[model samples]
Target: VLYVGSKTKEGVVHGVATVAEKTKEQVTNVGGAVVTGVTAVAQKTVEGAGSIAAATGFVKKDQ
Candidate 1:
């Protein structure tokens, strides 16, 4: 029982450290990249849609 407990603790620590390091790195990198890219893209997308709406409305009124 003692040896089994020691082995379990050793494996648990190793797995925890690996998971923590990878999770931190991925969350930081992915969060920033997606936030920055999506913000700029969303702004442009909204503006383009607005312009299209205005153009279509004006043309319909003219007809």
Candidate 2:
């Protein structure tokens, strides 16, 4: 079964990695791509994961 600790740990890790990559890109300016909004993306995704994790919290409740 998925646990809250598992989800949060992954969330924090994901955010850190994304931030690192984003920072690298910004510093090097190698890709010339603009970084806009993605920090919150991972957060939203984790919340989203919660809503659909185990027991299939999708179209209907598992009961």
Candidate 3:
């Protein structure tokens, strides 16, 4: 939305058209956002699913 210009009335900057071509940069944004959110959520869920069958409840000593 910042830097791809147009004709006469659109001459303010290298710009975009809310009425015309949305361009390549626009296409993957929604899918990218969706993927990142799902990745983070799944990571957290998997982290919480670790086994506790022989667990120690503390971090390692500084030996």
- Summarize candidate 1's per-residue lDDT along 14-34 as a digit string, tens digits: 222222233333335432223
Give all candidates' CA lDDT scores. Answer: 0.28, 0.40, 0.34
lDDT of 2 by residue, 5-60 (tens): 54345434233444244434333444344344444443346334343223322354
Give lDDT tens digits, candidate 3, residues 1-63.
Answer: 698657434213334334434455433543222222111111123335543234333555796
**What is the overall TM-score of model 1 with all chains considered together?**
0.11
User: Candidate 3: TM-score?
Assistant: 0.14
TM-score of each: 0.11, 0.16, 0.14
Give one clash count per candidate, in the order shown: 0, 0, 2
Best by lDDT: 2
Clashing pairs in 2: none
TM-score of predicted structure 2: 0.16
14 in model 3: Cα distance from truth in Å? 68
User: Model 3, residue 53: displacement in angstroms?
Assistant: 1.1
Top candidate when judged by TM-score against the true structure: 2
